[PDB]
Amino acid sequence: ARGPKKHLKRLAAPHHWLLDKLSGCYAPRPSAGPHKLRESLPLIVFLRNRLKYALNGREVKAILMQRHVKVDGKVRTDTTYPAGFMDVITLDATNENFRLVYDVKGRFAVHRITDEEASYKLGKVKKVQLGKKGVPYVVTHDGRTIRYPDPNIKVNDTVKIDLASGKITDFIKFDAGKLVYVTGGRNLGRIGTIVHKERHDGGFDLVHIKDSLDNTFVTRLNNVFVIGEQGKPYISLPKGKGIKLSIAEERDRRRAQQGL
Amino acid sequence: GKGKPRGLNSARKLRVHRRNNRWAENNYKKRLLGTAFKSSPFGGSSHAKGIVLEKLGIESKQPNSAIRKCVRVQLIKNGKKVTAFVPNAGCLNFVDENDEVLLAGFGRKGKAKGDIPGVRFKVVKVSGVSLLALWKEKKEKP
Amino acid sequence: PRAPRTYSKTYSTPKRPYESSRLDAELKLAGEFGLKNKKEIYRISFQLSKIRRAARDLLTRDEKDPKRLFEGNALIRRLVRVGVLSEDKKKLDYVLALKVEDFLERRLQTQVYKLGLAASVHHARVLITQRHIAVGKQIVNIPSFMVRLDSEKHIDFAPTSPFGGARPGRVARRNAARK
Amino acid sequence: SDAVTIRTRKVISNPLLARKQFVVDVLHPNRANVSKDELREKLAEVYKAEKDAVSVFGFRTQFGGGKSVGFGLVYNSVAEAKKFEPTYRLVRYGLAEKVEKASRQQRKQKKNRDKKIFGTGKRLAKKVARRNAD
RNA sequence: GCCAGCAGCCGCGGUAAUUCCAGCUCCAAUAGCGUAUAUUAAAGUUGUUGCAGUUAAAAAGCUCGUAGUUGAACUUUGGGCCCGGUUGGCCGGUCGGAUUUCCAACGGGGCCUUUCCUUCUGGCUAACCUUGAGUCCUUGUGGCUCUUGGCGAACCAGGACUUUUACUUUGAAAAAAUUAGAGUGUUCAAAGCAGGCGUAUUGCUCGAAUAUAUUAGCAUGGAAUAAUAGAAUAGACGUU
RNA sequence: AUGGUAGGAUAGUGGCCUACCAUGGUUUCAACGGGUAACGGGGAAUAAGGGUUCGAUUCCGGAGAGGGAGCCUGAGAAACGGCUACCACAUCCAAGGAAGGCAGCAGGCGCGCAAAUUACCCAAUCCUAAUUCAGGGAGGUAGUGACAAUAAAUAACGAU
């Protein structure tokens, strides 16, 4: 119905935001993100319905205003900043340092990191062009725009940047035996292999993986994100390493852990 | 090899040869022309408003004798002219001419009840206050 | 608009209404177990009729398949906690040989009766509606409660209550204020 | 009473607003549940912030009474409350007198009474007497 | 005394009326009863679950047919080793629950028996075929601290290529009010989102749930059922 | 009518409309037509399962403002407590000319089986301002009220 929608009926919000189902008629949404809308978030969630550090949302304007939380080493005082996979969110009160990254189950997660590690991030590479005055550049799922970069870099990998600067330190490749975080699809929220791409070619490329318990599998090329060589996985990873469990196992560890 | 096509590609000829059949079965007749809206009094309903004319007397059908109590109505709609039937006592008395009455079915559909002939409705209210009361004396009338 | 809140009736009536057959086994029930209306014999009846199929459903997976065991071993332990079926019977199988009448003994309504603290079944109930009985230090005012086995031993009389404490109880602030 | 006892829960060291957040609990024998004003003191007593700089909304009061629970908020220094505080609250404690705008009905009708007037319209006052006296 | 009248239907009333009119008497609901209309259940008298079609109302006059609808079977079964969940026994190990040997049920991941896992370039390794050292103690396949040759799918991310469907799993995304439902003594209840304790002289608090929420669409594990596709004027891998 | 190509048109897209072009698009898996006493749904009655009916009506959409059109302002209207007409209504008049839209609350009429006080307030609830302060038949709250629903008095105990 005529221009584009500016609201968001709560229900229609994605089910890993995990949002209640009552009280708030409406959820949010994110404006024009460097992220994709659905596989992202706002701080108005991450700073009450997850962590606690708010009570209200009015309260969450009042923490931001204060210019007291930096995403990618930069302020923002949006209220629905469209953050995402890979991010930095630093707590100025608090050296407190969260890398966004999914649960295993299914989630987002609440993962702390190593005031050192806020430092860099794992730039995906999304395309490549000699562009404008005749200059090459890679444009990064972060929706971010990177120039004079090496030609060894090709289509479908990461590249560590420096947040302080938009440098392009180290890049990794896409080859039959590297670690992989799966971004989106049943398997988001898991690692980690490239057994074998399975080329084709309209389009649909497919991938094979495994994991630390030897389980396996096949998903879309699209939804893959290299991080390191089996080992050094360029992070950290949240618990349970990111692993998947025939609920036959899960139930157990909550029975192991009955302690209170 | 009974009378129907059976193998695999015999979708086409089935979704037709039930959809034909259904016809006749009376019910699926009402629901496609569906009659309910055009024919009959209430059309696509359950209840309605009417205002009385005479207080007609209709004797019996026969294994019976029984001179019952009926009223013509004027509905407040198609206008048909209907009769209808009263319960309890005399019940008649309490339906004083050109009064407002609230009509409903007779639980039989269409059809036509017990020992009455072309008759197909009951008088539930009057004025809108029961009959049920304006015979167990829980109210009275204006 | 808001998330339209969700609700299922518990009752599932009978297919034939009237019977001097099944009728004169409700009035043998009510009765013997307290109850009230027929809107109890039929609550249960539903919730047994509920469980009953999740067995049927399974049995027809193979045996050994992930789903069948998990529910069974989760299904079962939900009924070990409520006392319903024994320890020794739980294979699965077997929950099926559970008639209406087993559940009823594990209603608080009656578990009080047995823990006598009640003349007859009745003096077993006013006794629940009147805030009198208590599980932790906590009152419960509703006959249909369903006894969780591992509580049971914690069933009182509370501080509040007149039959174990805070005061005498109304009719006593009367025989002492007319000599 | 047989005394209150305020056993408290979920302590979070909020750092962004000086705060200090938690979930309060309460064993009361014969009180008939428990008054705020009074309550604060009990936390202040312990937590060193002289009442005032304190909150404690939505007590609710087990089903017999007996037990209460809510919500724990210790500010650092009353100064900070005066900032992140929701006014509706301080009018519970008498820390902020209460504004005595109209009912809303008026506050709306009064936008639709200067919207027609392009300006002050203080040349409608002397366009009064060039319309009366003629 | 077949006239008044009643009676939803069967029917009373034509000189002793258990029905009308009315007296007493009793029965049923009861601050609420009756009455008429419409709808529901009753209705397995619209029917998929669940009908009837020898004569009750119904098999076309009989055959061919484009749709519709159904459609024989056959394309990895078996066995081999593992290792672990959490129900159930046998000790309660103890001032009513914590777990080990003994041990049944039962799922489930590996891996191997000729065994695709779209698969290449990194980074990733996560695991042991490793074993540089060894030994707390039941006269030892009961117990895990450590770098070096060597595990790839625990996974990032670019590509080349990865038949397709329905079906099913989960999971999300889903407006409250309603409906089910936990709490909770509005004096009870219908309700409601409240209340609970103190030093009731000045402060403490527990909450305000879960669940249903289907028909379309996504993401997802299943690979039985049921379809469908590759190669019979020749294709398939390829070290040349 | 269905597409092509280009322009005008719009805040834009598009046979939206026009220049020229091509002959297409729907249809027994129910189109187009006729009916609807049809505003849609959330949901309400019924309640073993499967069901059948009703959802004008307390929230979410849309549609009108007596019919029909066209447009001034403004970001924001095809507005009806804004204007021009037109037509169907009907008011004032010194007959020259004016002025008008309850299906907002009220109330009366008419219709009819069928449904209430020309009452008191911004104190709550919330909205409009230039704005704490005005104003708000939005809202509330009394009156009438058997629509339903909740609780539950109308007699206890003697002794004879």
**Burial status of residue A54 (CB atoms within 10 A of its CB: 0-12, 13-18, 19 or more):** buried
A139 and A214: one domain? no
Nearest chain A residue to D11 by CA distance is A52
CA–centroid distance for D7 within its chain: 25
| DSSP per-residue codes, D13-70 | ---TT---EE------SSS----STTT--HHHHHHSSTTTS-----------------
Q: How far apart are CA C26 and CA C41, in angstroms?
A: 7
A202 and A230: one domain? yes
CA–centroid distance for C61 within its chain: 31
Residue appearing with tokens 């569906």: B34
- In sign, the C-alpha dihedral spanning A249, A252, A254, A259 is negative
Strands (E), chain A: 69-71, 88-91, 98-99, 180-181, 225-226
**Burial status of residue C69 (CB atoms within 10 A of its CB: 0-12, 13-18, 19 or more):** middle
Residue appearing with tokens 């008939």: D32
**Is-contact C76 C68, C-beta < 8 A?**
no
Q: How far apart are CA B39 and CA B30, in angstroms?
A: 10
The single-letter code of the amino acid at D59 is F
Q: How far apart are CA B122 and CA B85, in angstroms?
A: 5
A194 and A223: one domain? yes
Domain range enclosing A91: 1-116
- In sign, the C-alpha dihedral spanning A144, A150, A152, A158 is negative
Please give the method by which this entry was determined.
cryo-EM
Structure tokens given for C129: 């509606």
**Alpha helices (H) along chain A:** 43-46
Cross-chain residue pair C3–A247, CB shorter than 8 Å? no
Strand partners, A146: A138
Residue appearing with tokens 């004169």: C24
**Burial status of residue B12 (CB atoms within 10 A of its CB: 0-12, 13-18, 19 or more):** exposed
Measuring CA to CA, how many Å separate C119 from each of B33, C123, C127, C143, C155? 69, 6, 10, 16, 16
A15 and A95: one domain? yes
Number of domains in chain D: 1
A95 and A112: one domain? yes
Smallest Cβ–Cβ distance between A94 and the set D15, D71, D84 belongs to D15
A54 and A136: one domain? no
Q: How far apart are CA A160 and CA A166, in angstroms?
A: 9
Domain range enclosing D52: 1-134
Q: Could you say which DSSP state residue C47 is in?
A: H
- Residues with Cβ within 8 Å of residue C55, at least 6 apart in sequence: C92, C93, C95, C96
Measuring CA to CA, how many Å separate A215 from each of A106, A205, A231, C68, C163? 17, 21, 18, 22, 62
- Residues with Cβ within 8 Å of residue C67, at least 6 apart in sequence: C58, C61
Measured to protein CB atoms, the chain F nucleotides within 7 Å are 11-12, 28-30, 35-38, 41-43, 47-49, 53-54, 59-60, 112-115, 122-139, 146
**Is-contact A119 A163, C-beta < 8 A?**
yes
Does residue A29 fall inside a structural domain? yes
Resolution value (Å, 1 decimal): 3.7
What is the widest separation between alpha-carbon atoms in chain D? 86
- The alpha carbon of residue A47 is apart from the nearest alpha carbon of chain D, in Å, by 11
Q: Could you say which DSSP state residue D78 is in?
A: H
Does residue A251 fall inside a structural domain? no
Pairing label, strands B50-51, B70-71: unpaired
Cα first-last separation, chain B: 74
Q: How far apart are CA A111 and CA A90, in angstroms?
A: 12
Number of domains in chain A: 3
For A253, list phi and psi in degrees, rounded to 5. -60, -15
SS3 category, A118: helix
The answer to whether residue C3 neighbours chain A at the CB level (below 8 Å) is yes
